[PDB]
Amino acid sequence: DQDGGAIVAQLTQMNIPYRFANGSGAIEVPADKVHELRLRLAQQGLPKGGAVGFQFSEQVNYQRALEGELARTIETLGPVKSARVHLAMPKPQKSPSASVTVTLEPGRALDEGQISAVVHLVSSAVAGLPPGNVTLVDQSGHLLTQSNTSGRDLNDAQLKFANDVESRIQRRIEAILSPIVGNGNVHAQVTAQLDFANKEQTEE
Amino acid sequence: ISQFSEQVNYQRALEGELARTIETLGPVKSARVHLAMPKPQKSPSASVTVTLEPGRALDEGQISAVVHLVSSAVAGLPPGNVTLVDQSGHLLTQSNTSGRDLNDAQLKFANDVESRIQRRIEAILSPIVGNGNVHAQVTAQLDFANKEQTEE
Amino acid sequence: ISQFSEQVNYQRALEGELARTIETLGPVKSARVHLAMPKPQKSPSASVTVTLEPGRALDEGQISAVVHLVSSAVAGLPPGNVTLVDQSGHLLTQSNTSGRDLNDAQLKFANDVESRIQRRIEAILSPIVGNGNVHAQVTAQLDFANKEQTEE
């Protein structure tokens, strides 16, 4: 694989720890540095993230093993205390998706670069997964970026604008009620109805 | 020397440039591009064939991005006429632009509204009874009929 | 010698100049630009492809800056027709940006007004009861309709 040659070159700058096995698809690096490695390697290395750190049930066994490995990898992220990844296969074309359950630190929060990194990690770690199919999810809030469809884009714009108004009002209510009863003792959900019909009027 | 010969060379130059622009993306080995512009009033069309890296499959948004590249590279070419095809299947459907794909788009939009309302209900009602102790399914009926109205 | 050949060279010169203009920015590795101008009335279009530095992702204001560069570099090219795409996905929601511009503009303007009023209230009430002993949230309704009137 030619991409491996583009991956070993990045590492030789950082610290030069590696063990290149006979196979061209496998690379061995001490896990203590793999924790931080597989974040930059995600931004660089596409195929499967083959960085190993140190019949139906057959594929499920690795499937659970792969899910646990990705859960451990995402668990080591800074603003993440624990994480778990669920992988879905096409039962019977069917697009394969995946769900990533993550527990964050109370004080920290995820950023857009981190969202891109984690979604690309999950998509790359399993073959045949478009990154659009991967869905992040947390305990209380949901932090994702997927909002698009083949539908008329005007309707997509209307949906996103409605969501924006909803978010602004909910933020205002949360901010005003937060100092009284506490930081995490209130929730609010708002739904709105909007006008999208052209109108005119003339009075004499 | 002839105008036609110069136009032919221009088209080859554009095809090469567009291809070379396309391989710059990550998940693709290579691509080949063909164009068709009516010289003397039909919209121009284009066809793109992509040889794709095996371990990765492309997105819908990436389809939109490539279609936008091809559509904006040519003055008169609308994004509808772009056709992208991969080694296995064609990653675009325009056989009935005003028909079946429109109805499929309606289905996706309805599903989107359903998903948003279901998510709202789940999020609001989860903290009371528990994280995994509630499920919700929603169905909606939508309007797709053009209407006008006037009053005096 | 022919006019058409000279115009072809002109377009390449402009594309290269805009390229080296673009890589002068910090976060960008490289970029290539294609243009389309109708010779004989359709607005010209442009497409920009940018390969980006790995550790950085570019911002919305930077998107607007690049679009303004491309739009103002060409006389007849409106800012809408610019299309920008990155290595992975396209960083421009141009498809129906027309609908979703006025809406976000109204949202941000309303936010500005409410922020100003809240700042005034906080400033006036701060010295009396203490620095951190008061909070205020303000919501306002705005009129965005076009109206005229005549009286005789």
Swiss-Prot record, chain A:
<protein>
    <recommendedName>
        <fullName>Flagellar M-ring protein</fullName>
    </recommendedName>
</protein>
<comment type="similarity">
    <text>Belongs to the FliF family.</text>
</comment>
<comment type="function">
    <text>The M ring may be actively involved in energy transduction.</text>
</comment>
<comment type="subunit">
    <text>The basal body constitutes a major portion of the flagellar organelle and consists of four rings (L,P,S, and M) mounted on a central rod. The M ring is integral to the inner membrane of the cell and may be connected to the flagellar rod via the S ring. The S (supramembrane ring) lies just distal to the M ring. The L and P rings lie in the outer membrane and the periplasmic space, respectively.</text>
</comment>
Swiss-Prot record, chains B, C:
<comment type="similarity">
    <text>Belongs to the FliF family.</text>
</comment>
<comment type="function">
    <text>The M ring may be actively involved in energy transduction.</text>
</comment>
<comment type="subunit">
    <text>The basal body constitutes a major portion of the flagellar organelle and consists of four rings (L,P,S, and M) mounted on a central rod. The M ring is integral to the inner membrane of the cell and may be connected to the flagellar rod via the S ring. The S (supramembrane ring) lies just distal to the M ring. The L and P rings lie in the outer membrane and the periplasmic space, respectively.</text>
</comment>
<protein>
    <recommendedName>
        <fullName>Flagellar M-ring protein</fullName>
    </recommendedName>
</protein>
